[PDB]
Coordinates of all heavy atoms in Angstrom, one line a residue:
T1 N -10.7 4.3 -2.7 CA -11.9 5.2 -2.6 C -12.4 5.1 -1.2 O -12.7 6.1 -0.6 CB -12.9 4.5 -3.6 OG1 -12.4 4.3 -4.9 CG2 -14.1 5.5 -3.6
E2 N -12.3 3.9 -0.7 CA -12.7 3.6 0.7 C -11.7 4.1 1.7 O -12.0 4.5 2.8 CB -12.9 2.1 0.9 CG -13.8 1.8 2.1 CD -13.9 0.3 2.4 OE1 -13.0 -0.4 2.1 OE2 -14.9 -0.1 3.0
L3 N -10.4 4.2 1.3 CA -9.4 4.6 2.2 C -9.6 6.0 2.6 O -9.4 6.3 3.8 CB -8.0 4.6 1.6 CG -7.5 3.1 1.4 CD1 -6.1 3.2 0.7 CD2 -7.3 2.5 2.8
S4 N -10.0 7.0 1.7 CA -10.3 8.3 2.1 C -11.0 8.3 3.5 O -10.3 8.2 4.5 CB -11.2 9.0 1.1 OG -10.5 9.7 0.1
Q5 N -12.3 8.3 3.6 CA -12.9 8.2 4.9 C -12.1 8.8 6.0 O -11.2 8.2 6.5 CB -13.2 6.7 5.0 CG -12.9 6.1 6.4 CD -11.5 5.5 6.3 OE1 -11.3 4.3 6.5 NE2 -10.4 6.2 6.0
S6 N -12.4 10.1 6.4 CA -11.6 10.8 7.4 C -11.6 10.1 8.8 O -10.7 10.4 9.6 CB -12.0 12.2 7.4 OG -11.3 12.8 8.5
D7 N -12.6 9.4 9.1 CA -12.6 8.8 10.5 C -11.5 7.8 10.7 O -10.9 7.8 11.8 CB -14.0 8.1 10.7 CG -15.1 8.7 9.8 OD1 -15.1 8.3 8.6 OD2 -15.8 9.5 10.3
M8 N -11.2 7.1 9.7 CA -10.0 6.1 9.8 C -8.7 6.8 9.3 O -7.7 6.7 10.1 CB -10.3 4.8 9.0 CG -10.0 3.6 9.9 SD -10.1 2.1 9.0 CE -11.9 2.1 8.8
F9 N -8.7 7.3 8.1 CA -7.5 8.0 7.6 C -7.2 9.2 8.4 O -8.0 9.5 9.4 CB -7.8 8.3 6.1 CG -6.5 8.1 5.3 CD1 -5.9 6.8 5.2 CD2 -6.0 9.1 4.5 CE1 -4.8 6.6 4.4 CE2 -4.9 9.0 3.7 CZ -4.3 7.7 3.6
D10 N -6.1 9.8 8.1 CA -5.7 11.0 8.9 C -6.4 12.2 8.5 O -6.8 12.4 7.3 CB -4.2 11.2 8.9 CG -3.8 11.8 10.2 OD1 -3.9 11.1 11.3 OD2 -3.3 12.9 10.2
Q11 N -6.6 13.1 9.4 CA -7.2 14.4 9.1 C -6.3 15.1 8.2 O -6.7 15.8 7.2 CB -7.4 15.2 10.4 CG -8.0 14.4 11.5 CD -9.5 14.1 11.1 OE1 -10.4 14.8 11.6 NE2 -9.8 13.1 10.4
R12 N -4.9 15.1 8.4 CA -3.9 15.8 7.6 C -3.8 15.3 6.2 O -3.7 16.2 5.3 CB -2.6 15.6 8.3 CG -1.9 16.9 8.4 CD -2.5 17.8 9.6 NE -1.8 17.4 10.8 CZ -1.3 18.3 11.7 NH1 -1.4 19.6 11.4 NH2 -0.7 17.9 12.7
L13 N -3.8 14.0 5.9 CA -3.7 13.4 4.6 C -4.9 13.7 3.7 O -4.9 13.8 2.5 CB -3.5 11.9 4.6 CG -2.5 11.5 5.7 CD1 -2.8 10.2 6.2 CD2 -1.1 11.5 5.0
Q14 N -6.1 13.7 4.4 CA -7.4 13.9 3.8 C -7.4 15.2 3.1 O -8.0 15.4 2.0 CB -8.5 13.9 4.8 CG -8.8 12.4 5.2 CD -9.9 11.9 4.4 OE1 -11.0 12.5 4.3 NE2 -9.8 10.7 3.9
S15 N -6.7 16.2 3.6 CA -6.6 17.5 3.0 C -5.6 17.5 1.9 O -5.4 18.5 1.2 CB -6.1 18.5 4.1 OG -5.2 19.4 3.6
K16 N -4.9 16.4 1.7 CA -3.9 16.2 0.6 C -4.5 15.3 -0.5 O -3.8 14.7 -1.2 CB -2.6 15.6 1.2 CG -1.7 16.7 1.6 CD -2.3 17.6 2.7 CE -1.2 18.1 3.6 NZ -1.9 18.9 4.7
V17 N -5.8 15.1 -0.5 CA -6.4 14.2 -1.4 C -6.5 14.7 -2.8 O -7.3 15.6 -3.2 CB -7.8 13.8 -0.9 CG1 -8.8 15.0 -1.1 CG2 -8.3 12.6 -1.6
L18 N -5.6 14.1 -3.6 CA -5.4 14.4 -5.1 C -6.1 13.4 -6.1 O -6.8 13.8 -7.0 CB -3.9 14.5 -5.4 CG -3.5 15.9 -5.8 CD1 -3.7 16.8 -4.6 CD2 -2.1 15.9 -6.2
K19 N -5.8 12.1 -6.0 CA -6.3 11.0 -7.0 C -6.4 9.7 -6.3 O -5.7 9.3 -5.5 CB -5.4 11.0 -8.2 CG -6.1 11.5 -9.4 CD -5.2 11.6 -10.6 CE -5.9 11.6 -11.9 NZ -6.5 10.2 -12.2
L20 N -7.3 8.8 -6.9 CA -7.5 7.5 -6.5 C -7.5 6.6 -7.8 O -8.2 6.9 -8.7 CB -8.7 7.2 -5.6 CG -10.0 7.7 -6.3 CD1 -11.2 7.3 -5.5 CD2 -10.0 9.3 -6.4
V21 N -6.6 5.5 -7.8 CA -6.6 4.7 -9.0 C -6.5 3.2 -8.6 O -6.0 2.9 -7.5 CB -5.4 5.0 -9.9 CG1 -5.6 4.5 -11.3 CG2 -5.1 6.5 -9.9
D22 N -6.9 2.2 -9.5 CA -6.7 0.8 -9.1 C -5.3 0.4 -9.4 O -4.5 1.2 -9.9 CB -7.7 -0.1 -9.9 CG -8.3 -1.2 -9.0 OD1 -7.6 -2.2 -8.8 OD2 -9.4 -1.0 -8.5
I23 N -4.9 -0.9 -9.2 CA -3.5 -1.3 -9.5 C -3.7 -2.6 -10.4 O -4.6 -3.3 -10.2 CB -2.8 -1.7 -8.2 CG1 -3.9 -1.8 -7.1 CG2 -1.8 -0.6 -7.8 CD1 -3.2 -2.5 -5.9
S24 N -2.7 -2.8 -11.3 CA -3.0 -4.0 -12.2 C -3.0 -5.2 -11.2 O -3.9 -6.0 -11.3 CB -1.9 -4.2 -13.2 OG -2.1 -3.5 -14.4
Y25 N -2.0 -5.2 -10.3 CA -1.9 -6.2 -9.3 C -1.1 -5.7 -8.1 O -0.2 -4.9 -8.4 CB -1.3 -7.5 -9.9 CG 0.0 -7.7 -9.2 CD1 0.2 -8.8 -8.4 CD2 1.1 -6.9 -9.5 CE1 1.5 -9.0 -7.8 CE2 2.3 -7.1 -8.9 CZ 2.5 -8.1 -8.1 OH 3.8 -8.4 -7.5
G26 N -1.3 -6.2 -6.9 CA -0.5 -5.8 -5.8 C 0.2 -4.5 -5.9 O -0.4 -3.5 -6.1
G27 N 1.5 -4.6 -5.6 CA 2.4 -3.4 -5.6 C 3.1 -3.1 -6.9 O 2.6 -2.6 -7.9
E28 N 4.5 -3.3 -6.8 CA 5.4 -3.0 -7.9 C 4.8 -2.9 -9.3 O 4.8 -1.9 -9.9 CB 6.5 -4.0 -7.9 CG 7.3 -4.1 -9.2 CD 8.7 -4.7 -9.0 OE1 8.7 -5.8 -8.5 OE2 9.6 -4.0 -9.4
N29 N 4.4 -4.0 -9.9 CA 3.9 -3.9 -11.3 C 2.6 -3.0 -11.4 O 2.6 -2.2 -12.3 CB 3.6 -5.3 -11.9 CG 4.9 -6.1 -12.1 OD1 5.9 -5.6 -12.6 ND2 5.0 -7.3 -11.5
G30 N 1.7 -3.1 -10.5 CA 0.5 -2.3 -10.5 C 1.0 -0.8 -10.2 O 0.5 0.1 -10.8
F31 N 1.9 -0.8 -9.3 CA 2.4 0.4 -8.8 C 3.2 1.2 -9.9 O 2.9 2.4 -10.1 CB 3.4 0.0 -7.7 CG 4.3 1.2 -7.2 CD1 3.7 2.3 -6.7 CD2 5.7 1.1 -7.4 CE1 4.5 3.4 -6.2 CE2 6.5 2.1 -6.9 CZ 5.9 3.3 -6.3
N32 N 4.0 0.5 -10.7 CA 4.6 1.1 -11.9 C 3.6 1.6 -12.9 O 3.8 2.7 -13.5 CB 5.6 0.1 -12.5 CG 6.9 -0.1 -11.7 OD1 7.8 0.7 -11.8 ND2 6.9 -1.0 -10.8
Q33 N 2.6 0.8 -13.2 CA 1.6 1.1 -14.2 C 0.8 2.4 -13.8 O 0.5 3.2 -14.7 CB 0.6 0.0 -14.4 CG 0.7 -0.6 -15.8 CD 1.9 -1.6 -15.9 OE1 2.7 -1.6 -16.8 NE2 2.0 -2.5 -14.9
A34 N 0.4 2.5 -12.6 CA -0.4 3.6 -12.1 C 0.3 4.9 -12.3 O -0.2 5.9 -12.7 CB -0.8 3.4 -10.7
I35 N 1.6 4.9 -12.1 CA 2.5 6.1 -12.3 C 2.5 6.4 -13.7 O 2.4 7.6 -14.1 CB 3.8 5.7 -11.7 CG1 3.7 5.8 -10.2 CG2 4.9 6.7 -12.2 CD1 4.9 5.1 -9.5
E36 N 2.7 5.4 -14.6 CA 2.8 5.8 -16.0 C 1.5 6.4 -16.4 O 1.4 7.4 -17.1 CB 3.1 4.5 -16.8 CG 3.0 4.7 -18.3 CD 3.2 3.4 -19.1 OE1 3.2 2.4 -18.5 OE2 3.3 3.5 -20.3
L37 N 0.4 5.7 -16.0 CA -0.9 6.2 -16.3 C -1.1 7.5 -15.7 O -1.6 8.5 -16.4 CB -2.0 5.2 -15.8 CG -1.9 3.9 -16.6 CD1 -2.4 2.7 -15.7 CD2 -2.6 3.9 -17.9
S38 N -0.7 7.7 -14.5 CA -0.8 9.0 -13.8 C 0.7 9.5 -13.5 O 1.1 9.6 -12.4 CB -1.5 8.9 -12.5 OG -1.7 10.2 -11.9

């Protein structure tokens, strides 16, 4: 949610802003869950 912020993030990605979700934990397992969920 914080990452958006165009001053830090890129101008180009910001225009690609689709969804923001939490992660169960870190990467892989949170990462896999977020995809299933989304």
Side-chain angles (χ1 to χ4, degrees):
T1 307
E2 205 184 24
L3 286 178
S4 267
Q5 137 263 242
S6 176
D7 333 83
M8 226 186 290
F9 216 58
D10 210 66
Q11 312 290 263
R12 228 78 88 131
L13 315 148
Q14 282 265 311
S15 141
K16 269 60 146 184
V17 74
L18 247 68
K19 249 174 159 286
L20 53 172
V21 202
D22 219 280
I23 16 169
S24 273
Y25 112 112
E28 161 159 54
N29 296 305
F31 169 63
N32 284 272
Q33 244 83 227
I35 284 163
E36 174 183 9
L37 293 156
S38 186

